[PDB]
């Protein structure tokens with residue numbers, strides 16, 4: 145049903161998914177006037193991120209992004225509850241306007257953005273069940289800019305040709321997912337928000353790292369051009385591009401920062 | 405009953421107004437990747453903008469906005485038909501966040517925005533009719549930044565405290581509307597877009613001037629605290645603040661500029 149363009153684009157999500165028109169919607173612009181240092185924001189610890197290279201993890205194209213399934217022994221420690229990983233995926237723009245992060249910083253997009261989705265496994269049995277519940281989800285967001293080639297992101301990007309079309313899947317050998325995180329992960333923005341796709345439930349604790357990672361121009365172009373939303377046999381293919389939500393209003397609220 | 409905040413705010417407009425989820429939506433972020441210089445975009449001429457000071461024009465709060473009615477003898481020359489003025493209005497933020505323009509430039513909001521709405525009077529007998537026809541409307545947008553006191557904007561703002569509530573009306577003596585436009589009107593952005601409120605019709609030819617005008621902090625504060633969306637007797641009053649739509653996706657679309665650099 146829902147898409148990022150045309151008649152079924154983000155202004156019409158709230159028909160079928162009423163939370164998309166409710167409170168606490170993400171993503172948002174991160175800008176200095178709404179930032180406030182909170183010394184309670186200590187470093188997260190990423191446990192079980194070094195995935196067994198003797199295990200394979202499913203990469204899918206689901207017609208909205210590309211997702212990598214992650215094992216529930218992978219978790220974040222440092223939040224009030226343990227949050228266990230469920231999947232990671234990316235958002236991007238298109239080669240004519242290669243500025244497709246979801247969050248913006250001082251009004252500026254980054255080229256792309258990686259999200260590592262986790263759910264409160266102390267309170268809930270699985271990610272779906274947690275996804276509409278209080279304290280349900282925690283997402284780590286990495287902002288991505290063009291720069292150097294990044295061998296670690298290429299661990300995912302080398303498999304994109306096998307998940308070109310909707311419904312397709314590939315197996316990815318385990319690698320250390322912490323290699324996808326930026327420098328100085330102690331430095332981050334934190335706020336309470338929502339899923340950025342339907343059903344837009346306002347159940348996400350967001351952690352957006354302050355520092356971006358770099359990928360090369362070729363890796364960015366590959367991510368922007370490799371994938372389609374549509375099934376292989378669809379006579380009207382659509383490229384998977386511009387798969388980010390516009391920023392939401394965020395008034396009389398703060399975004400907490402772990403850095404001054 | 406649509407609003408800019410809460411359950412009836414902008415992500416819900418398309419439930420009742422389908423064009424709000426349609427094509428060609430405004431406003432947009434004006435940034436380099438989507439600009440293209442077009443030498444055919446020659447200067448507009450503003451005719452009959454100098455409204456007589458002995459005449460008076462109706463200022464009205466309709467609950468979603470405050471508009472000044474303008475006479476159909478006021479025209480823009482330069483488009484592919486004559487477009488005659490119908491009304492102007494503003495968009496703004498709030499006292500704790502004076503960043504309420506609709507268009508943004510390279511990701512930055514301006515303090516407020518003035519829209520002067522025109523309709524194709526060669527083709528249509530009124531703006532209402534024009535409003536659902538392709539390029540039936542042409543809106544001029546002036547980006548407003550916090551700066552010096554502006555006596556020309558004050559000719560409007562000094563009356564707003566007199567139209568505080570929905571349905572209220574006041575008369576504003578004529579003045580030269582061109583005093584609301586910025587320097588170097590020849591430099592503008594041009595694109596096909598939409599109304600930025602419901603019903604979000606995709607029928608507007610937008611001209612956004614490159615250069616902002618300034619109004620003062622005190623003018624912004626008065627603008628941001630003077631008006632209500634509700635009637636004088638409403639037991640649930642709602643301040644008219646933050647009355648701007650977020651910028652829209654704009655892909656496949658280009659914005660044409662009359663300036664190259």
Ligand SMILES: NS(=O)(=O)c1c(F)c(F)c(S(=O)(=O)CCO)c(N[C@H]2CCCc3ccccc32)c1F
Pocket residue numbers: 206208209210211230231232233259261271272275283338339340341342343
């Ligand atoms: N930006 S975001 O908000 O992090 C974000 C996405 F962008 C996004 F596309 C998805 S997806 O399934 O629809 C495609 C895989 O990526 C998700 N998963 C959510 C929504 C569906 C229900 C559910 C159930 C359990 C865990 C997560 C989710 C998502 F969380």
Ligand SMILES: NS(=O)(=O)c1c(F)c(F)c(S(=O)(=O)CCO)c(N[C@H]2CCCc3ccccc32)c1F
Pocket residue numbers: 466468469471490491493519521531532535543598599600601602603
């Ligand atoms: N930002 S914008 O897109 O320029 C813009 C507004 F912001 C704005 F609030 C209004 S409104 O106050 O009339 C309430 C809107 O339903 C308008 N007027 C349009 C829309 C309704 C039909 C009509 C008929 C004659 C003249 C103008 C208009 C508007 F054009």
Ligand SMILES: [Zn+2]
Pocket residue numbers: 233234235259340
């Ligand atoms: Zn995401």
Ligand SMILES: [Zn+2]
Pocket residue numbers: 493494495519600
């Ligand atoms: Zn307007």
